[PDB]
């Protein structure tokens, strides 16, 4: 008898749920490929371990 008050709450929560994944994708999916460092660590004395 309270109408469709439920649907908007469900919709808003779903929107937040999608927004979180959108944020993660935007902030990290910045490179189209995958690179790997060479096994040799000869960087003129610079250490990145």
């Amino acid at each position: 008898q309270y109408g469709s008050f439920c649907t908007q709450l469900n919709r808003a929560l779903t929107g937040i749920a999608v927004e979180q994944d959108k944020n993660t994708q935007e902030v990290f999916a910045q490179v189209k490929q995958i690179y790997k460092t060479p096994p040799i660590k000869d960087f003129g004395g610079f250490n990145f371990s």
């Binding site: 109408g3 908007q8 808003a12 910045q30």
Partner: protein, 49 residues
């Protein structure tokens, strides 16, 4: 109660739209009126105009 819910939702959406508009205004100011140096702000790659 229904009207209150609608008003609150509209206010939040308006805030989001204002943020988007501010970003758009900065983009128009920098990527169009001149040559930008920030990378990926005015499209992928080196920006020209």
């Amino acid at each position: 109660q229904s009207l209150q819910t609608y008003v609150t939702q509209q206010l939040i959406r308006a805030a989001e739209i204002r943020a988007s508009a501010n970003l758009a205004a900065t983009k128009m100011s920098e990527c169009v009126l001149g040559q930008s140096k920030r990378v990926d702000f005015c499209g992928k790659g080196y920006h020209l105009m």
